[PDB]
Amino acid sequence: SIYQGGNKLNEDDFRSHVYSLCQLDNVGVLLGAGASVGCGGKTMKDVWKSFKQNYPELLGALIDKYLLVSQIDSDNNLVNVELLIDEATKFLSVAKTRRCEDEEEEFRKILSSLYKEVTKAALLTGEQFREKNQGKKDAFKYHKELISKLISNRQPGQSAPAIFTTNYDLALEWAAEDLGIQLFNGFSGLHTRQFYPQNFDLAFRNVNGHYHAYLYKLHGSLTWYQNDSLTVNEVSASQAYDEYINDIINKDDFYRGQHLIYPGANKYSHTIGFVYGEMFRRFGEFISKPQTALFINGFGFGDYHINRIILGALLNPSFHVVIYYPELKEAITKVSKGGGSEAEKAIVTLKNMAFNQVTVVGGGSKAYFNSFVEHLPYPVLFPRDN
Amino acid sequence: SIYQGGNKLNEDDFRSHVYSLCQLDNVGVLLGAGASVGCGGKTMKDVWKSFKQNYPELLGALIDKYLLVSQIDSDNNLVNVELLIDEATKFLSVAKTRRCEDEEEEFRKILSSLYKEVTKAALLTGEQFREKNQGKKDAFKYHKELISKLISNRQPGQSAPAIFTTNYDLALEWAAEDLGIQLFNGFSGLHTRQFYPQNFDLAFRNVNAGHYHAYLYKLHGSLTWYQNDSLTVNEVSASQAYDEYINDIINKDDFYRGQHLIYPGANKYSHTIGFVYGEMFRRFGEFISKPQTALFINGFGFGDYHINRIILGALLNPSFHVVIYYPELKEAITKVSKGGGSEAEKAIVTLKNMAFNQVTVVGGGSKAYFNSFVEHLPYPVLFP
Amino acid sequence: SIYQGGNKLNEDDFRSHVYSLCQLDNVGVLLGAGASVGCGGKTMKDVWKSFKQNYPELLGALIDKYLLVSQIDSDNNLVNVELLIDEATKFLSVAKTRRCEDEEEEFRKILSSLYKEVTKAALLTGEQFREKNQGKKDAFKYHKELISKLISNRQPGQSAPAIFTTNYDLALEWAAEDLGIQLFNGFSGLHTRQFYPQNFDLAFRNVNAGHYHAYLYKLHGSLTWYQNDSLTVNEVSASQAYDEYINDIINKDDFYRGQHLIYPGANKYSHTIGFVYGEMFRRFGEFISKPQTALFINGFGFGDYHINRIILGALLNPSFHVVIYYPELKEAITKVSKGGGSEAEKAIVTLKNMAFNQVTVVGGGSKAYFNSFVEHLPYPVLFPRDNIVDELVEAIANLS
Ligand SMILES: NC(=O)c1ccc[n+]([C@@H]2O[C@@H](COP(=O)([O-])OP(=O)(O)OC[C@H]3O[C@@H](n4cnc5c(N)ncnc54)[C@H](O)[C@H]3O)[C@H](O)[C@H]2O)c1
Ligand SMILES: NC(=O)c1ccc[n+]([C@@H]2O[C@@H](COP(=O)([O-])OP(=O)(O)OC[C@H]3O[C@@H](n4cnc5c(N)ncnc54)[C@H](O)[C@H]3O)[C@H](O)[C@H]2O)c1
């Protein structure tokens, strides 16, 4: 629930709040890991569990040789993988300057298998993934709802809603032409498609219908890769499945960064990709807009740049924010005894920030994509005095 | 329980009045000593008592050789270092003109002992004053919140707000760095911090197309406000200030001339070396000449002569409102009626008794403290 | 000895073009290590030489058991100090993970000695670092004048330029703060500092109409910069650093405890300092979106990657203007012919062979002096070109 000075609050207040915020000029939707959980998605903990189960030798070596993770820490349920890739890369640069060969196989296989597992926890449908007609499955219904609601609540003089989703899975570009609404992905042509960031000026206008939305993913894509020519590309899904996913899954060759996405601890250790620059240019250039609203469904509070380029620029009271945090009382009790991770402590700032223009939203599992897109209203035509 | 010019007002009506006033263009402030004193600060009387317990050797001779106060007068608690520093300086100048070596040594001791208690109890952090992370200290949250408020309901086309106070509490910049606020106090720079009028005309702008501000003004000298006595007034960071010329004075019982310019004296003109005054009040009066502008005062007796000489002659401009917080207004009214008051009581009772309504009164004990100031100054509301 | 697109032009046209380019609305400058040699800086070769003199028993064992450097490159002073320090931190963390102490204490002493030999040079004032107003010296005063020459001939509402130099001393802070200019670098505040980066993209303006403001883009960090125990970044007045961590870094022998400081590029692998450093790089790159980006190259070793990454990315710009300052080609051609130069020399000489008219080179021996750079800039017509301040200052000083 919501408390204000020791008095309970009703849901209608928050409903009217979000309705009015949507009525503001600009709006944006942030979508974290919770963007797709009911479609078959899994959290990083499940990825690590599958990684350790598939290759127990790696867990044994970690327990014995180096101890980059402790059993008690895993029991505490705080295992982090984001630091493990960067640890491995720093280790391997050290070895490349040291020339220790007999100890490389362990870590190179660790990289290969970890990337395999991470890429495996996002298809959400297994073999069913490959065939067509998936776009019409009941699983992807809510994405259609969002693709409809916010794309038409745009009277002349207002910009289209912003998409900010940062997960592995593929669920945003398959409800697009199912209902015909293009959440712009920007890849022209039929056979040879190239990525051109200069396509940031797309908008339909009726000259002689008038539907557009805005895509901005803070995760890369499950099908973005570098071909040694300094390029990135997303193409059809089953095409990639039949092309290169099988090679990574089975062959497990000496790993080069076949398809580049950056789930890890330090992004700048992956500074080869400046598209991070563009995406966070957008997300740091949007918070400053006055009379703008942000609907945050799934902000894990774990990443650094997100949690440092939110508060650092909230200091103008015309941009309005709110987050859907499932566990309110449990999280408050946990934080009162020391806090959680390094970045999530920023919640305390919003628990105590000097902006009387927000209020936390929670309740538990009832604040995911489903309710997030269901609780919004539909545009009303022909208002009457009443 | 609130009156103005013969018109009654209640709590809800008072809240509406203060909100409507806050919608006016400009609102001033006086976060008097009754804001940080409660948090652990000390008043001039407490400093006087601390000095009395310290240096227990003069009390016998001074009450006999010079008689600057009697036992009955001391009991009455009618002391004020404001004039006592001036009298000590006059005494010592006489001594130097006449060369009573004992008098010179005695009054050097008097000066270098009296200019310490007012400072060495004005840190509120002990030796931690050289450390960092003191901005996030829980003892200043009040300040933090207030500043945010006074920058939220500031719509475009209205001048920046005014904070006017002088007290020895190093607080406001210890509440502007957690919040990212950027107050201005006429100075500039980390390492070489001095006065610079060119910094009085800076406003925040967005180059592409998160900015907070407010105005600071001190009228007595900050604990880090000093000069090299060679036509060079300087300000210094907290740690360097503790390191260079503040540790010995605290804990070495040595001599002390006017090292760092702090003016708790009364005459404030014998020290014509200090031009600070000459400029700061240039703004205070200039702050109150406007119409449809308010001033807030948090627990002020109005003791100073200069303060009640540009204020009483400010109500002449009609729409200039004014606000005073005073718990024990009855005491001042009675003392004035008894005809035994100083600048403070006379001026306060005069401005309360004026038949006009530009006077706004807040009182009732602790209800006039900083808590009401934080509670009342309003946030904007659009979707209640 | 003037080269401009391969076409020779008279001196009058050269000076006219230089003056016209010197008064551009948009200016983007990236000065190299050698460009500031005349300002009193010390090249990293001297730092390494003094380091080896301090501890000449390290290079042999270093190569023998770590191969961190090649013998020839170290002998010829072709090693990277910041890269070596970062790789030393990498070895140190590896040893901490695997408890390779016999290597941890073999790295600790050399790391602290690198500190002792590098930090001692960046202050530029030694015992006078503890004194205020130290930037008033006439030698550096000209720099302030340049700022005036870069601000006294600028119209209102003009675009913001940016100049980044490899040297990262705090002389800029002392100069600006004796000049009374406020600074928005991220450490906004004075008593308990923090890093607030949004103000990067804001500027000071006058409510009535003065136009004196600059952006402190210290991509390199700076001598004060140190992360305290809290996962944040702070700053200190000069005396704080000069009497709490500069001293042991210069006076005591081996007073090294852990990963604390923010120079040079020390803890990249940790998220915090990575966001501390790379954000300025990005936000500069977040500003080079204009078609008139300007670049300058001087003494680049072609060993870096991220800077080289952006260089390769942006080198395909038809509207790119390049100016190179390197008065060493005459003395380097013979060295290259005899035995061959380094990677940077080969790269630059190969690039020069390209028939591009957008690359300019400035030379002429004595003509490349700092003073000549000062006069080459525009000069106000109405400014009094006479010597009267000196006499008045002397008369005032004589009194009392
Ligand atoms: N060029 C680019 O676009 C770019 C740049 C930098 C980073 N990235 C990507 O952006 C970042 C996003 O990664 P991400 O997957 O961690 O973001 P995320 O918000 O989707 O997930 C963060 C975490 O929150 C957890 N979580 C979800 N629901 C929760 C709940 N109810 N309670 C507690 N925890 C919950 C998830 O298990 C875990 O993913 C990664 O660094 C990387 O994937 C992309
Ligand atoms: N900067 C300058 O050069 C300059 C210029 C003009 C005047 N002055 C000085 O300004 C005048 C005021 O000095 P001051 O502002 O530092 O205060 P003060 O020390 O001179 O007066 C006593 C102090 O005790 C506080 N106090 C006492 N009882 C209180 C209560 N019940 N509630 C709240 N606060 C209470 C008052 O706020 C404060 O005035 C002096 O008379 C005069 O010397 C200085």
Ligand SMILES: NC(=O)c1ccc[n+]([C@@H]2O[C@@H](COP(=O)([O-])OP(=O)(O)OC[C@H]3O[C@@H](n4cnc5c(N)ncnc54)[C@H](O)[C@H]3O)[C@H](O)[C@H]2O)c1
């Ligand atoms: N990774 C880089 O190449 C790079 C580039 C610019 C700045 N920095 C900053 O540089 C470090 C601090 O600045 P600094 O004191 O090292 O100034 P610096 O002048 O030494 O650094 C500028 C450049 O000079 C190069 N260089 C250094 N020594 C060289 C040598 N002996 N021969 C050829 N080239 C050489 C370096 O590749 C590069 O850092 C920090 O790690 C980091 O903040 C690093």
